[PDB]
Design a protein around this ligand. Structure first.
Ligand SMILES: *[C@@H]1O[C@H](CO)[C@@H](O[C@@H]2O[C@H](CO)[C@@H](O[C@@H]3O[C@H](CO[C@H]4O[C@H](CO)[C@@H](O)[C@H](O)[C@@H]4O)[C@@H](O)[C@H](O[C@H]4O[C@H](CO)[C@@H](O)[C@H](O)[C@@H]4O)[C@@H]3O)[C@H](O)[C@H]2NC(C)=O)[C@H](O)[C@H]1NC(C)=O
Ligand SMILES: *[C@@H]1O[C@H](CO)[C@@H](O[C@@H]2O[C@H](CO)[C@@H](O)[C@H](O)[C@H]2NC(C)=O)[C@H](O)[C@H]1NC(C)=O
Ligand SMILES: *[C@@H]1O[C@H](CO)[C@@H](O[C@@H]2O[C@H](CO)[C@@H](O)[C@H](O)[C@H]2NC(C)=O)[C@H](O)[C@H]1NC(C)=O
Ligand SMILES: *[C@@H]1O[C@H](CO)[C@@H](O)[C@H](O)[C@H]1NC(C)=O
Ligand SMILES: *[C@@H]1O[C@H](CO)[C@@H](O)[C@H](O)[C@H]1NC(C)=O
Ligand SMILES: *[C@@H]1O[C@H](CO)[C@@H](O)[C@H](O)[C@H]1NC(C)=O
Ligand SMILES: *[C@@H]1O[C@H](CO)[C@@H](O)[C@H](O)[C@H]1NC(C)=O
Ligand SMILES: *[C@@H]1O[C@H](CO)[C@@H](O)[C@H](O)[C@H]1NC(C)=O
Ligand SMILES: *[C@@H]1O[C@H](CO)[C@@H](O)[C@H](O)[C@H]1NC(C)=O
Ligand SMILES: *[C@@H]1O[C@H](CO)[C@@H](O)[C@H](O)[C@H]1NC(C)=O
Ligand SMILES: *[C@@H]1O[C@H](CO)[C@@H](O)[C@H](O)[C@H]1NC(C)=O
Ligand SMILES: *[C@@H]1O[C@H](CO)[C@@H](O)[C@H](O)[C@H]1NC(C)=O
Lengths: 123, 460, 123, 123
């Protein structure tokens, strides 16, 4: 497709279009602005890739973590979320609790890595 | 069994490095339409929450004399000062010979009239104009005993670039923030002598409030100490190293001036107008600075009893500056956009022999110390590459209700069996003030990579 | 904890805090200086990431390498290293030996990858 | 042996020299050109790394992908391809069908990731 093809479609149908959308993250008076824009595009992509690389989901479009999901963040059913809600108002609703989720994934990744280190050094 | 190496990422180990730093200014400094001179368009704003985290049990060596932020701050101040005088009025059509007399009937004995001719907004027409230039800005070019020919001082060497009459020299505070991947270590030890280890190192991102005051021979507004008077020096052996005295109790200092008429506007072409000194109404007086007597006396007594620790059986003395011209022997500063160069003969006239004198008199606070002085208008500061100005005058009287923080001293060379040595005040280079305001901080670089021994076996 | 929360803490307790010191490596007169410093920070992070990835330890904080440790480098017991020492003295007395360690890790990664492609090609 | 060890050699002979040919991707008036070349090197390395990282071949040479090879691109047997032809003219005749190939690997990788998602969620 192109730039944000499934920008308003079903939640489930928006999970098979991650490749054709994430590909375009890098592709005098009017010479400073172009270079500054290119550098800040590199800044945003490297920040996103590093944030994916902290909690052990590097190089994967869809990654699973073992942190439990608290019901106080959403209090909603899975079926109508995945078959009826567009990504936009979902991100609008969860925007009040993103830092707690990021910290929980960070702590869960560090704890899982320490348990893996203990299990691997046990042998 | 045996040791196998494992790589670690995100490791807190340090190195010393020299990188450029940012700015940080308050939110109130951007709503001003006067554009200031530093923090309105170039420097970035800061968050209103400076987070500081204290580290546990780390000891780090500090050397405030071999520092990088002092040189970078000096270079940034010099470059930003030279970039702020480019779109301003240049006084190139003012090198015409002046005919100067006494200031009317009953001359003021400090200014000359100095009437000349100038080119107006039309390139052919010329008109006769007058001003009141100060005496240290007037040079007697002559070939005989002529008492009516005079000229301006900066036409002889280099440039006459006037400061713009919109910016101000008000010293608002700034903060220096380290870039990404760097930190700033700050020592919180109260008995920090300037060089050596510190055991209360805290990591910070942005520095505290630093006011870049223009001052020599005496420190103006700045950060106070915590417990007692602190001596800063690097060797304390020779007589050619400037010693810094950091005080604990401030002493009030004011500076005043008599009246002037207005800014007389004189045009020298299309748009380029300069404001010269007009007339003087009322009687003329002297521009003087007042300092409290007993506060200065017991402050110097405290400096004496604290400096006696480094010299056990020697008495200390003070006298005048060690010779020179006007710009180095006088305490020089600015207030309200007008510069002051003032004699310090009545402040450093005394001695201490080790016997403390207590001053217990409530009614003796009326007595003060007066410092009589003149005003210059062309500033040749930074000891070179200064871009020689012409400071515009102010209409009414001004006040300088200020605060004092530190002192700059220099020991004199003694003779044989000289148990009584002297301490004369001296300024010199500009780096001493910002070095006195940046003793705590040190820039540091973190290396996130490391290695460690364990028993990890990677599965195949 | 933010900047350097365990810069002098216990060696065994400093292995629980590598995430917060790795999360923050990117976060006219002065149109060139800050640009140069920002590009330098980007290449510092990219050099660190490429040096991690050159011995097969990309996207993983504490990675393990099968090359052994010689007795002429540290000759010190593991228990009191991991329970008494800090990171700064370790960087003080190991940093003169780091280049040959990096070369050994590079050679071990080369050997591991060559055995991997030999096993993939023989099957 | 650094850049272009076997740039005009056999197709099958270039497979064993891939570990030494792709090692140096990162290792006033004349300050702006240095800055532009520096930023352009950063752009090239990050674009190459993300484009190798979309279809699940991050940090792995000779990566195998389950997408079928259409016969409308080459229509010629692999024997003389891998023992007769060099890289340059093959790149000349394949360059008209690169975007369709990249889209096919992107779709195959994303479908593989969704299949792994359903397989791990089935337990
Ligand atoms: C060390 O610290 C002291 C104290 O913190 C500083 O003293 C201050 O200095 C500044 C300027 O250097 C003074 O600001 C000036 O005050 C003048 C008088 O203020 C009175 O009158 C105004 C109304 O006219 C009242 O609002 C005010 O509250 C006072 O009652 C003003 O006339 C000045 O205005 C000039 O500047 C503005 C903006 O640039 C222009 O728009 C004007 O046209 C005019 O040119 C100016 O605001 C301040 O008053 C001083 N504090 C005190 C308590 O007096 C020292 O400067 C500082 N540094 C040194 C080296 O000593
Ligand atoms: C400096 O000299 C000028 C000219 O000699 C003085 O200007 C004259 O001032 C008198 C007032 O006493 C006026 O009547 C004249 O018209 C002025 N002549 C001009 C403007 O060309 C000026 O006053 C002198 N400066 C001072 C401070 O007295
Ligand atoms: C033009 O400037 C030069 C300096 O570059 C002057 O030379 C000295 O200036 C100082 C400062 O007033 C005097 O004290 C010295 O007596 C001057 N001479 C020497 C030999 O050092 C020079 O005098 C200036 N021109 C005029 C006409 O004054
Ligand atoms: C710092 O090290 C000393 C040395 O044993 C230890 O007693 C102290 O608890 C340490 N500080 C912290 C905050 O852990
Ligand atoms: C200046 O120009 C005027 C022109 O009106 C002339 O009369 C005068 O002699 C010139 N020189 C001086 C020193 O005033
Ligand atoms: C170190 O400085 C902090 C700054 O607030 C202070 O609270 C602390 O007491 C100091 N450490 C010691 C040992 O005094
Ligand atoms: C400066 O200090 C060093 C060591 O601290 C000393 O050797 C040297 O003699 C000192 N300089 C003078 C002039 O005494
Ligand atoms: C200060 O310097 C002058 C310079 O001649 C000298 O005469 C005097 O003795 C010195 N000491 C004092 C205390 O004035
Ligand atoms: C300062 O004052 C003293 C005494 O009042 C005087 O001798 C001296 O010439 C004055 N000026 C300087 C620059 O020292
Ligand atoms: C210094 O103080 C003494 C004692 O009050 C006084 O006689 C003298 O005039 C003062 N000034 C100088 C320049 O010595
Ligand atoms: C000097 O100016 C201040 C205000 O800046 C004013 O309060 C004071 O009265 C003035 N001095 C005189 C003698 O009028
Ligand atoms: C200087 O002292 C006065 C009174 O002692 C005080 O009001 C003023 O705030 C002090 N200056 C600074 C910059 O703190």
């Amino acid at each position: 497709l192109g730039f944000l093809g499934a920008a308003g479609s079903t939640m489930g149908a928006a999970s098979m279009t991650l490749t054709v959308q994430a590909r375009n993250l890098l592709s005098t008076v009017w010479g400073i602005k172009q270079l500054q824009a290119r550098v800040l595009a590199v800044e945003r992509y490297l920040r996103d890739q590093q944030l994916l690389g902290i909690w052990g989901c590097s190089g994967k479009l869809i990654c699973c973590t073992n942190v439990p999901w608290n019901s106080s963040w959403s209090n909603r059913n899975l079926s109508e979320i995945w078959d009826n809600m567009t990504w936009l108002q979902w991100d609008k609703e969860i925007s009040n609790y993103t830092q707690i989720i990021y910290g929980l994934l960070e702590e869960s990744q560090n704890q899982q890595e320490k348990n893996e280190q203990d299990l691997l050094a046990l042998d | 069994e045996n040791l196998w190496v494992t790589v670690y990422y995100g490791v807190p180990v340090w190195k010393e490095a020299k990188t450029t730093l940012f700015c940080a200014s308050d939110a109130r400094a951007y709503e001003k339409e006067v554009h200031n001179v530093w923090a309105t368009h170039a420097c970035v704003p800061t968050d209103p929450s400076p987070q500081e985290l204290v580290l546990g049990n780390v000891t780090e060596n500090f050397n405030m004399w071999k520092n990088d932020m002092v040189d970078q701050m000096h270079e940034d101040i010099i470059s930003l000062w030279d970039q702020s005088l480019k779109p301003c009025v240049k006084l190139t059509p003012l090198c015409v010979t002046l005919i100067c007399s006494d200031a009317g009937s009953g001359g003021v004995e400090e200014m000359k009239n100095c009437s000349f001719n100038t080119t107006t907004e039309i390139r052919d027409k010329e008109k006769k104009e007058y001003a009141l230039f100060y005496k240290p800005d007037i040079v007697p070019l002559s070939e005989t005993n002529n008492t009516s020919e005079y000229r301006l001082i900066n036409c002889n060497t280099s440039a006459c670039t006037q400061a713009c009459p919109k910016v101000t020299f008000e010293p608002i505070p700034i903060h220096y923030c380290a870039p990404a991947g760097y930190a700033i270590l700050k020592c919180n030890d109260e008995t920090f002598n300037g060089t050596g280890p510190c055991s209360n190192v805290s990591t910070v991102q942005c520095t505290h409030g630093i006011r870049p005051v223009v001052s020599t021979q005496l420190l103006l507004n700045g950060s106070l100490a915590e417990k007692e008077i602190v001596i800063r020096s690097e060797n304390l052996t020779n007589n050619a190293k400037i010693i810094i005295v950091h005080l604990h109790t401030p002493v009030e200092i004011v500076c005043t001036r008599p009246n002037n008429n207005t800014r007389k506007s004189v045009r020298i072409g299309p748009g380029q107008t300069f404001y010269a000194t007009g007339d003087i109404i009322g009687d003329i007086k002297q521009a003087h600075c007042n300092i409290s007597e007993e506060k200065w006396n017991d402050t110097l007594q405290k400096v004496g009893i604290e400096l006696q620790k480094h010299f056990p059986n020697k008495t200390i003395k003070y006298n005048q500056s060690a010779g020179g011209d006007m710009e180095i022997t006088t305490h020089s500063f600015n207030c309200g956009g007008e510069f002051f160069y003032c004699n310090t003969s009545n402040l450093f006239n005394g001695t201490y022999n080790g016997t403390y004198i207590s001053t217990n008199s409530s009614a003796n606070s009326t007595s003060t110390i007066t410092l009589q002085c003149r005003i210059k208008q062309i500033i040749n500061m930074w000891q070179g590459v200064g871009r020689c100005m012409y400071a515009p005058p102010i209409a009414g009287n001004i006040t300088c209700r200020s605060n004092i923080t530190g002192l700059l001293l220099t020991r004199d060379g003694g003779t044989n069996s000289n148990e009584t040595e002297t301490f004369r005040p001296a300024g010199g280079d500009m780096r001493d003030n910002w070095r006195s305001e940046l003793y705590k901080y040190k820039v540091v670089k973190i290396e996130p990579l490391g290695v460690a021994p364990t028993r990890c076996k990677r599965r195949v």
